[PDB]
RNA sequence: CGCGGGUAAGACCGCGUGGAGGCCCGAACCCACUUAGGUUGAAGACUGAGGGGAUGAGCUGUGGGUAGGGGUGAAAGGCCAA
RNA sequence: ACAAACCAGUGAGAAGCGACUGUUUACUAAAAACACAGGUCCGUGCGAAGUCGCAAGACGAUGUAUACGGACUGACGCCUGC
RNA sequence: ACUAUAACCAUCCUAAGGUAGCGAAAUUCCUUGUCGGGUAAGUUCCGACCUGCACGAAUGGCGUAACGACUUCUCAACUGUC
RNA sequence: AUGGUUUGGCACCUCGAUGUCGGCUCGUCGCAUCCUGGGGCUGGAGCAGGUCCCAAGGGUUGGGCUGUUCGCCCAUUAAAGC
RNA sequence: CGGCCAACUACGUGCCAGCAGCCGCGGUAAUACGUAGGGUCCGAGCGUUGUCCGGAAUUACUGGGCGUAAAGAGCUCGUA
RNA sequence: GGGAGACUGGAAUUCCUGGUGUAGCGGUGGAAUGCGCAGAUAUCAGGAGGAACACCGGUGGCGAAGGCGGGUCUCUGGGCAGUAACUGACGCUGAGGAGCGAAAGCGUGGGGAGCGAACAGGAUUAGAUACCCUGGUAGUCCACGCCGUAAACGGUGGGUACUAGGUGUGGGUUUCCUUCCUUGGGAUCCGUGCCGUAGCUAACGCAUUAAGUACCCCGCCUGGGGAGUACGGCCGCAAGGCUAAAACUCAAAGGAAUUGACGGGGGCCCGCACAAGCGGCGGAGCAUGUGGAUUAAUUCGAUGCAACGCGAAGAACCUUACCUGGGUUUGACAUGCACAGGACGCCGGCAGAGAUGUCGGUUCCCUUGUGGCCUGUGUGCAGGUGGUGCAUGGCUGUCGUCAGCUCGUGUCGUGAGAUGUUGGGUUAAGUCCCGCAACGAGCGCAACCCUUGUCUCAUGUUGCCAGCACGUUAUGGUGGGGACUCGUGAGAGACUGCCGGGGUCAACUCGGAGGAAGGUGGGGAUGACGUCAAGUCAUCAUGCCCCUUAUGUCCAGGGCUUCACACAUGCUACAAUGGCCGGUACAAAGGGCUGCGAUGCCGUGAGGUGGAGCGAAUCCUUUCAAAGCCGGUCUCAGUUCGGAUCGGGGUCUGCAACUCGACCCCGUGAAGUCGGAGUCGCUAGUAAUCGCAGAUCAGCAACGCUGCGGUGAAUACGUUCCCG
RNA sequence: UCGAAGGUGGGAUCGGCGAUUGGGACGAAGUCGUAACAAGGUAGCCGUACCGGAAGGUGCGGCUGGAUCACCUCC
């Protein structure tokens, strides 16, 4: 490390002492230092109790660390400047050991500015305690085609819709298939040829709607995280679509 | 163990009965620490003064067992007929 | 001169070693050496492990892991690091 | 920040580099180490320093009441040891 | 240049045996003299020394520490000889 | 003779010499240092030191307190 | 869930055994030690063992306190309510004393799944005896005993009586709604919380569960350290516990609350702050400034933003304040008190580097009292870029053109202080609206000013020329003309003015029409209270101190330009989006009298001669430019790039270009191949790039500064990170 | 007989010195670190135990005299 000292007036021996005292702080800086300068001045007025003024500037990897002290002589000023610079460099570290106690920790305990925001679902929580099923629509079970079902979707502003298919005579549910288009799920999977003709670009889910109970359906919805579950009820034997409502209850659509 | 004091009861504290201990002093008995004598000796390991243990891991009597590259050894290369 | 003869503890302070009573080179060494009560580790599930025996057989033990054998250390106190 | 040492740092090597405790000691050659006590005079003794040639934790480390025909130093009495 | 009083060198001397240091007791000899005795010069004023010649008749202490010889110390003494 | 605490200016000096009961004054322009004027309090006296009481309700009987300033025993039973 | 004892239940962790089964598992902010490939992790079945008891489960219950919940049984303590049968003050407190007393720790004997001091490695770090990771001994567990400490806290000793209430919740008795289901409600006793009177307190706060009003008893305190320490004593196996000083030292240590400041606290916002981009710096040569070194001197000031092409808008001499040397002293220059005068003053010669000295010619007008000049003699005095910007004024920077900073009266608090200035919304804004113990006001914001973008009226010279004539190439050049520009006077025009929609029908906001311009149109001038003892005693002034035969003053020469290095700001480049040559088209602004200076002529070219015309809308700076466009050539090379350095020859200014000017000509032809860590500027006529002009100026170090125009981009998803 | 003084002996108690050695107070500027105060960058403190050049670290139990928890849609 190389230091330049720009003294002023009569300060014999201050330059060497300041150089050798400040150059020892290179190991303290955790990043390479560049062009570290020091300046010594003396107050002309004898009325000042601490006439000597010392200033130091270091460029630690682009970060400017500067300090300034007053003293009665060159030696005291240089020593105080060294202590001040050491404290500043300690507060500057920014390496992991010095930035590990401020990084957000745990999952829910403690909150910080950069702590990860809580993931909130669209629905009101309404935990399993008194969740209940307080919405049961049975809008339409008149047979429809894919295009007619899509239009019945669109003006209802509902992502999924349960109807009964024209060609099959079976219950089916359409939903937005994402970027792939739309997706159709039937109680028993059938190919497109048996399905009534359509013009919208859709795809058919190959899996069949399984048979399961109400509590099992709620458990599957909870452990599978889908926006809804389409299934054949075990007791009823017919189609059913459960979705988490906008109040936290489950919306069971039945024929 | 008993009596008394003490306490709610004790703990505990005094006074007695008791006779424990590889306990103390010290004869027989068993050892052998010091010194002097002896050193062609009274004696092929003793004597005179002192000395240690002396109810025990004690001493001793009679009978018996372990045998040589083996015995036995509170361990010294000790003893196993000077 | 009155424990008149014989008989019959010298005492105190400190340090080292070994806790202590004991044992040891019969015949130049009795000690700080051996042993000891206590501690730890290892082996042994039962004619055990170990030992004496070519084998039978025997001790271990007429015992059974709170028992037996081997090794080191040596009361007791504070400990026993890598 | 006088001088001194070095709380501290760097480096090589190892499996690890001796912690507690003690130290001119039954270990220390230099050595009759240096200081204090004891004596008129103390190479022995006691207390301390640590520079441990070459202490050190069950080949145990440091202490310890009681005990010792063990070793060393001092005192009082006592005496033909003188 | 002397000496064989110091450590040495050789190994002629003894392994069918010549005690190895100090201390005690008892000596004898040399002088390269510590005191006493006789002188010289003094950088000897006297005192007292310094130093050097002659001189071996006599004398040349008791203790502390250490096994000590050696050595240091304590009191003396005419001196505390080699 | 800065404020407590009556009584201010000039010169000399400059973190020195020094002052001081406390707070605190000496850093070329000090009403706090030294000297001069001026002033004030006392006056055959004036100040300093030493000791006791008061102010000190600062051992609180008159006349104090204990949540956070010092202060409720860790909690009960019970002898005088 | 008060305590003790005994028996016993399930989930889960660990380990073992046996199947299926592969190549990873585990761990972190990221990894590595570690485990596994000899079969791990995962999954199933079985077995062994230890500890703790999910849900119930809470500011809910019990207990004197510590503390106490898997289930069942046995033994046992306390409390509450009602009846009031019973005894009849037997009550309260309690020095010492005894007992209980979390966790950790100690002793003996067991047990040991998980966790885990100590201890190992792994990781982070400049260093990690730590935080994080992999293992892991005591211990945590049981039995019998020790110790006797805790933030053992409600930091609040025990008993009693009284002093507004409101509302949760636990337990028990009873009256009335009455279904009598129902926290129905009421009354009452005993607990346990929250809010709030009076009252108390320094305040925070307590407030029927007192920290209120009083009575009885006990414990404890007398400033902070030294110190709950030493000595002595008691207890303890030990760790240690209890009782418990002094010397010395400090002038404070403390409790509550207020205003700031700060935070690796939170929330809401801004800014080329970041993000997306474009061009750079840091690498090379040169110009400039600074540090350091050097020197006789390298004059002085300026040290992050906010010093470092700054004071310096012009250092050869002068400047100049520094050095060497030479002179000078009422002085280089002012003004007053005096004595003598007619000269001061000039002009030539000589000596000197010059200052200066000397020589030669010239000599006052008033008016009699003297005045103007200087001489010397003097005497007051001048003169200091000598010190102190921590004594100052004035001037300036900066936070920051950010939106904030205060005051009057009122109100609250003992007081510092608080409200207003906070809250919701909105804005570029403390801008505004709605609320509000506040009502108003001031400096700040905005507006009023300049420029710029459109139009109207006025306006024609030196400015335009559209329609008419003359023109000679040479063109508004010339007569003429207001028509279009332009020049400069007045005015209009943007005001959410209008419409539609959000909006508390409020501020304000989104879109649309119109217009040249739409929402402070674009850019300026303007910088609140103050901060940083910021800068300036060197623009100037100035209190105090200092020099005064000198730190004043005159002159010559030199220095400020020195250079083994370091930092900063810029310029030129490293080339083909280019170099060179030829042709050719478009600006704005500004300057000019002892200055701009043309035509012509002479030089290759700086330049020389010469002087037309101009105090300038006229003449000159050329009619003005360069990038640009067209044509030719070069062909990816240290080159036809780059220009440094050096040799020679000249011009101009200046008394004088050696130290130390610029430019011109010939030759010479270095580094340099797009530049590490890091870092800067910029949101549109902007960055980038090209040229022109001005100040200072005899000449220039100008590549610097201040302006003018030419050509003219990319990107902005959005505030997580950096700075303010 | 009692009896002052004196002699002998073992203890008590109060002080002084003491080689070496422990801690305390203060000292602008020395060396090594960042422990605490803003969540002080690992919340702090109390009792206890172990470890470490040093502040300190960790284990068990306890206390708040510890900071923050945006947004939060149903109603």
Give dist(CA A184, CA A162) in Å, integer: 10
Distance A143 CA to G561 C1' (A): 103
Q: Which nucleotide is nearest to A98 (CA to C1')?
A: H41
Distance A159 CA to G206 C1' (A): 61
Question: Which resolution in angstroms does this entry have?
Answer: 3.5
Q: What are phi and psi of A139, to 5 degrees?
A: -50, -65
Give dist(CA A53, CA A72) in Å, integer: 9
Place of tokens 């957000």: A104
Count of H-run helices and E-run strands, chain A: 5, 12
Please, are residues A17 and A77 in contact by the beta-carbon 8 Å criterion? no
- Asked whether strand F has any atom less than 7 Å from the CB of A46, the reply is yes
Give dist(CA A200, CA A226) in Å, integer: 24
Please, are residues A81 and A3 in contact by the beta-carbon 8 Å criterion? no
- Protein-contacted bases of chain H (C-beta within 7 A): 28-32, 34, 39-43, 67-75
Nearest alpha carbon to residue A216 among A240, A247, A198, A189: A240
Distance A104 CA to G153 C1' (A): 33
Q: What are phi and psi of A215, to 5 degrees?
A: -65, -40
Place of tokens 């048996």: A194
- Asked whether strand G has any atom less than 7 Å from the CB of A5, the reply is yes
Distance A51 CA to G390 C1' (A): 10
Please, after which residues is chain A broken with C–N above 2.5 Å?
Answer: none
Contacts of A132 (CB under 8 A, 6+ apart): A249, A250
Nearest alpha carbon to residue A22 among A72, A71, A73, A88: A88
Residue A248's CB is within 10 A of a number of other CB atoms, namely 17
Q: Kindly state the tokens that stand for A233.
A: 């009820």
Give dist(CA A140, CA A201) in Å, integer: 23
Distance A46 CA to F9 C1' (A): 28
Give dist(CA A251, CA A237) in Å, integer: 18
Around A106, how many Cα atoms within 13 Å sit in the side-chain half-sphere?
A: 5
Contacts of A215 (CB under 8 A, 6+ apart): none
Q: What are A182's strand-pairing partners?
A: A176, A202
Across the beta sheet with A63-71, the strand order is A3-6, A33-42, A52-60, A63-71
- Long-range contact pairs involving A170-177 (C-beta distance under 8 Å, separation at least 24): A171/A141, A171/A238, A171/A239, A171/A255, A173/A228, A173/A230, A173/A239, A173/A241, A174/A146, A174/A149, A174/A150, A174/A202, A175/A228, A177/A202, A177/A203
Q: Tell me which method was used to determine the 3D structure.
A: cryo-EM
Distance A176 CA to G344 C1' (A): 118
- Asked whether strand F has any atom less than 7 Å from the CB of A49, the reply is yes
- Asked whether strand F has any atom less than 7 Å from the CB of A130, the reply is no
DSSP annotation string for A4-43 = EEE--SS-TTHHHHHHHHHGGGTTTSSS-EEEEEEEEEE-
Q: Kindly state the tokens that stand for A109.
A: 């305990």
Nearest alpha carbon to residue A103 among A113, A89, A91: A113
Q: Kindly state the tokens that stand for A47.
A: 């009325």
> Which residues in window 113-172 of A are less than 7 A from strand G by Cβ?
113-114
Distance A37 CA to G389 C1' (A): 26
């Amino acid at each position: 490390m190389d230091v330049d000292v720009s003294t002023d007036g009569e300060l014999p021996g201050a330059a060497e002492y300041a150089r050798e005292k400040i150059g020892r702080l290179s190991r303290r800086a955790h990043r390479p230092v560049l062009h570290a300068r020091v300046r010594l001045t003396r107050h002309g007025d004898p009325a000042v109790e601490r006439p000597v003024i010392a200033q130091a500037n270091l460029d630690v990897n682009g970060r400017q660390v500067r300090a300034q002290v007053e003293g009665v002589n060159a030696r005291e000023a240089v020593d105080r400047l060294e202590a001040r610079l050491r404290s500043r460099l300690e507060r500057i570290a920014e390496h992991w050991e010095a930035r590990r106690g401020g990084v957000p920790a745990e999952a829910g305990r403690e909150w910080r500015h950069e702590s990860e925001p809580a993931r909130r679902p669209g629905y009101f929580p309404r935990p399993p305690e008194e969740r209940r099923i307080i919405r049961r629509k049975s809008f339409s079970m008149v047979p429809c085609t894919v295009d007619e079902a899509a239009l019945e979707m669109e003006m209802l502003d509902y992502d999924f819709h349960l109807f009964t298919e024209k060609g099959t005579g079976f219950a089916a549910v359409l939903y937005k298939g994402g970027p792939t288009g739309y997706r159709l799920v039937l109680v028993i999977p059938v190919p497109a040829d048996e399905l009534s003709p359509f013009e919208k670009p859709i795809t058919i889910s190959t899996h069949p709607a399984p048979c399961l109970t109400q509590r099992d359906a709620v458990e599957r919805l909870g452990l599978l995280g889908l926006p809804f579950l389409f299934y054949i009820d075990a007791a009823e034997g017919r189609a059913s679509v459960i979705y988490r409502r906008y109040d936290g209850h489950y919306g069971l659509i039945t024929p």
